[PDB]
Amino acid sequence: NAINPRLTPWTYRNTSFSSLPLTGENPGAWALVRDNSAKGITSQQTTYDPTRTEAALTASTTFALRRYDLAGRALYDLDFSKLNPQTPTRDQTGQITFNPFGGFGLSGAAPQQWNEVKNKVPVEVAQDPSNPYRFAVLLVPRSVVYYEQLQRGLGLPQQRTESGSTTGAMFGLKVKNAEADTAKSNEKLQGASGQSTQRGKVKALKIEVKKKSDSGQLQLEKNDLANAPIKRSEESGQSVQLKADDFGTALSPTPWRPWLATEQIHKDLPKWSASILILYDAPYARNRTAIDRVDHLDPKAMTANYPPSWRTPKWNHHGLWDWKARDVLLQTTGFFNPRRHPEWFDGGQTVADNEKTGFDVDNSENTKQGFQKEADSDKSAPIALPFEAYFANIGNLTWFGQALLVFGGNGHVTKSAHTAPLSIGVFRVRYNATGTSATVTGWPYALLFSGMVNKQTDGLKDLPFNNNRWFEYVPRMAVAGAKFVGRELVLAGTITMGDTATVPRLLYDELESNLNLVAQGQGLLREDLQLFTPYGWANRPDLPIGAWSSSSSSSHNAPYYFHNNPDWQDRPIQNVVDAFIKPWEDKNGKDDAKYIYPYRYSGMWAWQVYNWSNKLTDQPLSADFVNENAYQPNSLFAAILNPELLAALPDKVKYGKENEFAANEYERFNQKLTVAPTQGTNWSHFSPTLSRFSTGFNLVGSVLDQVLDYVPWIGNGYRYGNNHRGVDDITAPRSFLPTFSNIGVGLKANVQATLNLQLWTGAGWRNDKASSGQSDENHTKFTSATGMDTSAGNPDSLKQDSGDSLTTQDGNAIDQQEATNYTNLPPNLTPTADWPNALSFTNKNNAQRAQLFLRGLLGSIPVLVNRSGSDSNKFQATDQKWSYTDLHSDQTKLNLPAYGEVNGLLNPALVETYFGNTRAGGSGSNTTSSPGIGFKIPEQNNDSKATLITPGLAWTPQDVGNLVVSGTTVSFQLGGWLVTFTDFVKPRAGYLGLQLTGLDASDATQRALIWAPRPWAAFRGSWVNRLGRVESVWDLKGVWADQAQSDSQGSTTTATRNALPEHPNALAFQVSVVEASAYKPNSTNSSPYLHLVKPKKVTQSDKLDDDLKNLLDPNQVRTKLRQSFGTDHSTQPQPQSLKTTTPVFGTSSGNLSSVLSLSPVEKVSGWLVGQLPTNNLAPNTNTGNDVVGVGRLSESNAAKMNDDVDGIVRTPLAELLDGEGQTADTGPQSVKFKSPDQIDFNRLFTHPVTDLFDPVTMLVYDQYIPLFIDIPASVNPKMVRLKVLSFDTNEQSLGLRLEFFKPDQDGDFLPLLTASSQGPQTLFSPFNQWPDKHHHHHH
């Protein structure tokens, strides 16, 4: 009873693995099989004990590995729970005892630690490339397979309000402006005090850190970085503070905790770890099976190699000033705080606060703070590897030599709607030469990717991938796989970049006016995208609390610390630098002091990110700033890795003292960014692992914006560009303004201005009209921008400092004759701003673009709205204008928020892609079919109470399929897009670098999948077909079942209960409030975007209306959009599965050479505009495909199938959906081995065995082939060969395999399965016989 007919194929979600096709010497397939009708783990709810759950699962579920032959016929099952395996014997050289007929030599004994690991279930197989009969089998506990049935979600912090006390906070956000501590007024930093009013030796801020030369050691005498004249505020006696208690007590609000702690898995490795067993397999042999050993992937093998700083992730190398500055601003402290990342903490949310950092943060003496501690009580929670994060890292086996590598999976195995468990590193099982012993290790990706520099990529530069000696950047992946492309090892999937969203730091008294940024910094709002709320930012985020106040008790502490405004910045001319920087510059390394220059700094999004994010440079381990780490994967990622180094690297990482944070504040002050790896360490030996990397396209940022506009939004098929004709559109002096491009938007201005370049302003222009009344200036005068016409242009009341300047002069022998500020400023500082000539005024940036691209494919880019689309609060097409004639006269008709939206895009353009208010409001057939959702500029004295929302698609950045290879390209399914890296392994000049094939929303079946509440639950894997096209299969039974049951039928739970649904893209967004007066302009400048948009401080009364807060439940938006598509004329019986195939792309597809042969951004724009061809769904005409390489599936490439799919069995000759269908042919059936008695005795058995075959080729000589086999005259003898499997000169036996030819023209030679009743092989004997008396001829 070899085949258990109760078991059928299945697909492991973490890797998309169902079967492994086997070619070569031991062909056919291995397939995952299980009892697909078992319920698994079996709304009031209950808590499931792991031990009991696993035991219940062992008794109620059945799993096996099913062996298939080359034709696709099932041979036998290996159910490890019922198998009685034996270890194979070896010979004197340590090689496995093996004969192709007898099989493996068996020892009579089961493997060591067998009966404790036998109940684990197989979820992957990888064939040893150096032994076709050897396989690595990955086994996991049954509980891991059914983990999603436990419904262990992550919850919100308990709120003492609701909105939608006071402050208008939603979803438990703690927000209150910080206040001046009157008892710590002396702790204000002091300058160097008279004449010159705009600056402060002569005028810098002094910071001193000095130790006692008297009375471990040190204990400190003075620590100016401990100073805090500003503190958190009180609410009902107690001070407003982040507490792990906010999530409830562990045993209604329950904190999220891992199902099993790291130590619980470690202490019961046979029961709870993932294990690699070594299996021997030979389906045509007598002893067909043997199991050598089992090796456990102990999570502690990985944690033992974690950088030492990971024991203390609430701390960073900036130490006390940074802990204090973040804590006072109601942010999380350190580089990997448990409030943002509870998945990697054994305590989960029970340790989610800024307390117990492993360093003194609250001593009664300031000079005792910043000290590293021992004890057992106040010791930190370390980055660990608990149940969910550990099993996220289990999958994708890759062999290289004697090393078996485990890269991890996409994290779907243990994911929850609001958690993001991912792969933190790579495990390795390194076997010795004979396979009698092995060693197990894990190394984090932080350590493996530690040599990253800009020149390693052909795509986006300056991306937040840089690191430092402290390993503050923690890259984590949703892994597609690790595949060999020729000899090159390619690792790909999605990755978490360093945090950029919370790099700008708000002024201590600006928190209550900027709730979204506070929420992102707090760990509440799990949004990695940069949001556009700059008015309240501090001019720079790297100043200590001592620099925030001033003994002069004026509006903040300008020029040092003030409201960020690039219009107020000092120009770096020789005299400005000489006066304010140079008298302090060469003193920062003397008598224990550091200085904050009286130089006025400021800049927009690209500038904040350039200076204080972990941007890649040309030098590795050079990130002086690693703000934090992303909540979720937020970039496409592919890396070429050195496999020889992976195979050879040591098991135990030896870190140095250079990797540890300083033991006190004195040593930290006198720290050096780059420090030499110390003697006896090996951590630096891991930096050469990664040789090259990709983030998708091979384009510069501003060119990628053009391509992003060409991409359709998978939700309805409309492009982010809204079919904008670029330079040939009517948005400059069928179509709408684009989301990402500035080309043909606003005016093309001849620039130089600040410090010829023909550049487009984009939407949100603020150009001065000029003293003529006709031609609009190519800039904004500093006069127009900074005037008091409380004031957004100058809230801190700064003043202007040979034609004389504007008084308040300084030192030197020149004293001034030129103003410190610039006179001509760029005419755009809104989110669409892209100034290559001015980093200080640019908002678009590569760190954002890499995210916008990934989110653009998933369809989850947030959109800012203030109209719910309900009858009364509807957005109408009459509310929106786009033509340059309409916009030059009145730019508020554009509905550009320039506050609250996603940075680096045009929000009303995005509103239009999603909701189509303009296009739907332009036809009789439907008429107001649009959901009526949008953002309208507030009128009169009315306020706009806006929120970011997602359109309701449920695709996540962990929706990553298996990695497939085709020529020199690699592909994987990312959400509803099949992504192919055409220019990574072998990059070609002038090629875009990616191919994109998406699901088609115009087809009802594909639309049902695109809009499914669990769309990734449908994925059944990709594979490359014989023609090199990528095929993907989708199961639709779950789509139809989920569509048949609506939980949110008329739900208003988000609006009334201040809670989020279990939708994967439900985010804790906050209200963004702007008064109509902010959109009123000012002297020849009538632009509503002249000043930075000044928001309103949020109070209880500034809450969203219920119908708008209800759109924060993404199913409510989804309901509105599906009503708009609304069509059910179904001919039935409804497709149950779908097979998609990538189209054939031409030789010139993606090639820009013909347009790159007008700036490059302008040429790319025109090329894309030339590739452009009412309704709520865009029709698929197929124009948007070939030439570009970006498009939606044609009808012919999307095959609807009548039955559902759980697993797929593939051999080199057959593809069997659920292991069923037509079985392939290995030959003609008429070609077969002769029976011994039918052989011409004198012509064949008379020879000794060694005469009959070439020992070099191991083939029977052509002259002897017809004597062994029956071959009809119609069949060519060259197509048949006899491979020698065995020979024995003692017994004169000869073991042969009959092989038949296929395509190259003499796969190639394949085993002829129908050769004999038993298969393709047979033993012939005895040879070396004395002659008989002629073979009879009767026929």
PDB file of all heavy atoms in Angstrom, residues 1256-1268:
ATOM      1  N   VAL A1256      34.721   3.894 -20.734  1.00  0.00           N
ATOM      2  CA  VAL A1256      34.851   5.354 -20.675  1.00  0.00           C
ATOM      3  C   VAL A1256      33.451   6.009 -20.743  1.00  0.00           C
ATOM      4  O   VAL A1256      33.070   6.705 -19.807  1.00  0.00           O
ATOM      5  CB  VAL A1256      35.838   5.896 -21.765  1.00  0.00           C
ATOM      6  CG1 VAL A1256      35.738   7.416 -21.931  1.00  0.00           C
ATOM      7  CG2 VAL A1256      37.277   5.478 -21.474  1.00  0.00           C
ATOM      8  N   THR A1257      32.689   5.761 -21.828  1.00  0.00           N
ATOM      9  CA  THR A1257      31.340   6.330 -22.016  1.00  0.00           C
ATOM     10  C   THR A1257      30.258   5.593 -21.204  1.00  0.00           C
ATOM     11  O   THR A1257      29.162   6.137 -21.012  1.00  0.00           O
ATOM     12  CB  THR A1257      30.934   6.328 -23.499  1.00  0.00           C
ATOM     13  OG1 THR A1257      30.808   4.975 -23.944  1.00  0.00           O
ATOM     14  CG2 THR A1257      31.899   7.113 -24.385  1.00  0.00           C
ATOM     15  N   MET A1258      30.565   4.353 -20.746  1.00  0.00           N
ATOM     16  CA  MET A1258      29.649   3.453 -20.019  1.00  0.00           C
ATOM     17  C   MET A1258      28.403   3.122 -20.875  1.00  0.00           C
ATOM     18  O   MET A1258      27.302   2.968 -20.359  1.00  0.00           O
ATOM     19  CB  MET A1258      29.305   3.950 -18.592  1.00  0.00           C
ATOM     20  CG  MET A1258      30.410   3.695 -17.564  1.00  0.00           C
ATOM     21  SD  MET A1258      30.906   1.947 -17.429  1.00  0.00           S
ATOM     22  CE  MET A1258      32.245   2.068 -16.207  1.00  0.00           C
ATOM     23  N   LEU A1259      28.604   3.032 -22.198  1.00  0.00           N
ATOM     24  CA  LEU A1259      27.575   2.677 -23.175  1.00  0.00           C
ATOM     25  C   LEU A1259      27.911   1.337 -23.865  1.00  0.00           C
ATOM     26  O   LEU A1259      29.082   1.064 -24.156  1.00  0.00           O
ATOM     27  CB  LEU A1259      27.462   3.757 -24.257  1.00  0.00           C
ATOM     28  CG  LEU A1259      26.963   5.129 -23.820  1.00  0.00           C
ATOM     29  CD1 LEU A1259      27.182   6.150 -24.923  1.00  0.00           C
ATOM     30  CD2 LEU A1259      25.490   5.073 -23.363  1.00  0.00           C
ATOM     31  N   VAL A1260      26.867   0.527 -24.175  1.00  0.00           N
ATOM     32  CA  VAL A1260      27.038  -0.723 -24.926  1.00  0.00           C
ATOM     33  C   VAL A1260      27.466  -0.300 -26.344  1.00  0.00           C
ATOM     34  O   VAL A1260      26.941   0.689 -26.873  1.00  0.00           O
ATOM     35  CB  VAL A1260      25.738  -1.569 -24.923  1.00  0.00           C
ATOM     36  CG1 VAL A1260      25.789  -2.717 -25.939  1.00  0.00           C
ATOM     37  CG2 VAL A1260      25.461  -2.113 -23.531  1.00  0.00           C
ATOM     38  N   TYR A1261      28.452  -1.005 -26.935  1.00  0.00           N
ATOM     39  CA  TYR A1261      28.904  -0.699 -28.299  1.00  0.00           C
ATOM     40  C   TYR A1261      27.731  -0.806 -29.281  1.00  0.00           C
ATOM     41  O   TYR A1261      26.884  -1.686 -29.103  1.00  0.00           O
ATOM     42  CB  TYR A1261      30.018  -1.666 -28.708  1.00  0.00           C
ATOM     43  CG  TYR A1261      31.284  -1.468 -27.906  1.00  0.00           C
ATOM     44  CD1 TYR A1261      31.786  -2.482 -27.096  1.00  0.00           C
ATOM     45  CD2 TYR A1261      32.010  -0.277 -27.993  1.00  0.00           C
ATOM     46  CE1 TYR A1261      32.973  -2.316 -26.382  1.00  0.00           C
ATOM     47  CE2 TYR A1261      33.200  -0.102 -27.289  1.00  0.00           C
ATOM     48  CZ  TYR A1261      33.678  -1.123 -26.485  1.00  0.00           C
ATOM     49  OH  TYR A1261      34.840  -0.932 -25.787  1.00  0.00           O
ATOM     50  N   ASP A1262      27.637   0.121 -30.263  1.00  0.00           N
ATOM     51  CA  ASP A1262      26.578   0.119 -31.286  1.00  0.00           C
ATOM     52  C   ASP A1262      26.343  -1.277 -31.933  1.00  0.00           C
ATOM     53  O   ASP A1262      25.190  -1.666 -32.151  1.00  0.00           O
ATOM     54  CB  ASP A1262      26.891   1.137 -32.388  1.00  0.00           C
ATOM     55  CG  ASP A1262      26.826   2.589 -31.968  1.00  0.00           C
ATOM     56  OD1 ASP A1262      26.829   2.860 -30.744  1.00  0.00           O
ATOM     57  OD2 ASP A1262      26.785   3.456 -32.859  1.00  0.00           O
ATOM     58  N   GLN A1263      27.442  -2.023 -32.219  1.00  0.00           N
ATOM     59  CA  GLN A1263      27.387  -3.365 -32.811  1.00  0.00           C
ATOM     60  C   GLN A1263      26.578  -4.360 -31.971  1.00  0.00           C
ATOM     61  O   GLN A1263      26.033  -5.305 -32.536  1.00  0.00           O
ATOM     62  CB  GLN A1263      28.801  -3.924 -33.117  1.00  0.00           C
ATOM     63  CG  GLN A1263      29.689  -4.194 -31.883  1.00  0.00           C
ATOM     64  CD  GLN A1263      30.957  -4.961 -32.208  1.00  0.00           C
ATOM     65  OE1 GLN A1263      30.966  -5.901 -33.000  1.00  0.00           O
ATOM     66  NE2 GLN A1263      32.061  -4.590 -31.580  1.00  0.00           N
ATOM     67  N   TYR A1264      26.481  -4.142 -30.633  1.00  0.00           N
ATOM     68  CA  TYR A1264      25.768  -5.073 -29.749  1.00  0.00           C
ATOM     69  C   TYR A1264      24.349  -4.670 -29.363  1.00  0.00           C
ATOM     70  O   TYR A1264      23.614  -5.530 -28.886  1.00  0.00           O
ATOM     71  CB  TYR A1264      26.600  -5.361 -28.486  1.00  0.00           C
ATOM     72  CG  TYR A1264      28.005  -5.877 -28.763  1.00  0.00           C
ATOM     73  CD1 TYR A1264      29.125  -5.200 -28.280  1.00  0.00           C
ATOM     74  CD2 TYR A1264      28.215  -7.034 -29.517  1.00  0.00           C
ATOM     75  CE1 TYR A1264      30.414  -5.648 -28.551  1.00  0.00           C
ATOM     76  CE2 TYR A1264      29.503  -7.507 -29.776  1.00  0.00           C
ATOM     77  CZ  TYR A1264      30.599  -6.816 -29.282  1.00  0.00           C
ATOM     78  OH  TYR A1264      31.882  -7.250 -29.516  1.00  0.00           O
ATOM     79  N   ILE A1265      23.950  -3.398 -29.557  1.00  0.00           N
ATOM     80  CA  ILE A1265      22.622  -2.834 -29.202  1.00  0.00           C
ATOM     81  C   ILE A1265      21.439  -3.702 -29.715  1.00  0.00           C
ATOM     82  O   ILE A1265      20.589  -4.050 -28.881  1.00  0.00           O
ATOM     83  CB  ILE A1265      22.465  -1.326 -29.615  1.00  0.00           C
ATOM     84  CG1 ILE A1265      23.399  -0.404 -28.801  1.00  0.00           C
ATOM     85  CG2 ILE A1265      20.989  -0.845 -29.534  1.00  0.00           C
ATOM     86  CD1 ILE A1265      23.546   1.023 -29.377  1.00  0.00           C
ATOM     87  N   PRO A1266      21.340  -4.047 -31.036  1.00  0.00           N
ATOM     88  CA  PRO A1266      20.196  -4.870 -31.508  1.00  0.00           C
ATOM     89  C   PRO A1266      20.081  -6.278 -30.906  1.00  0.00           C
ATOM     90  O   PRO A1266      19.028  -6.906 -31.045  1.00  0.00           O
ATOM     91  CB  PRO A1266      20.459  -5.024 -33.021  1.00  0.00           C
ATOM     92  CG  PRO A1266      21.407  -3.949 -33.367  1.00  0.00           C
ATOM     93  CD  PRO A1266      22.244  -3.711 -32.158  1.00  0.00           C
ATOM     94  N   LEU A1267      21.160  -6.797 -30.302  1.00  0.00           N
ATOM     95  CA  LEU A1267      21.172  -8.150 -29.727  1.00  0.00           C
ATOM     96  C   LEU A1267      20.427  -8.183 -28.384  1.00  0.00           C
ATOM     97  O   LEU A1267      19.890  -9.229 -28.024  1.00  0.00           O
ATOM     98  CB  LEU A1267      22.606  -8.683 -29.578  1.00  0.00           C
ATOM     99  CG  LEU A1267      23.461  -8.775 -30.864  1.00  0.00           C
ATOM    100  CD1 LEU A1267      24.922  -9.060 -30.534  1.00  0.00           C
ATOM    101  CD2 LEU A1267      22.957  -9.862 -31.817  1.00  0.00           C
ATOM    102  N   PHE A1268      20.375  -7.033 -27.663  1.00  0.00           N
ATOM    103  CA  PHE A1268      19.685  -6.893 -26.373  1.00  0.00           C
ATOM    104  C   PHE A1268      18.222  -6.457 -26.491  1.00  0.00           C
ATOM    105  O   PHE A1268      17.456  -6.673 -25.556  1.00  0.00           O
ATOM    106  CB  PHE A1268      20.381  -5.805 -25.509  1.00  0.00           C
ATOM    107  CG  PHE A1268      21.697  -6.205 -24.889  1.00  0.00           C
ATOM    108  CD1 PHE A1268      22.898  -5.862 -25.492  1.00  0.00           C
ATOM    109  CD2 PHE A1268      21.733  -6.964 -23.725  1.00  0.00           C
ATOM    110  CE1 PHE A1268      24.103  -6.225 -24.921  1.00  0.00           C
ATOM    111  CE2 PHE A1268      22.945  -7.307 -23.142  1.00  0.00           C
ATOM    112  CZ  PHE A1268      24.122  -6.948 -23.754  1.00  0.00           C
TER     113      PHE A1268
END
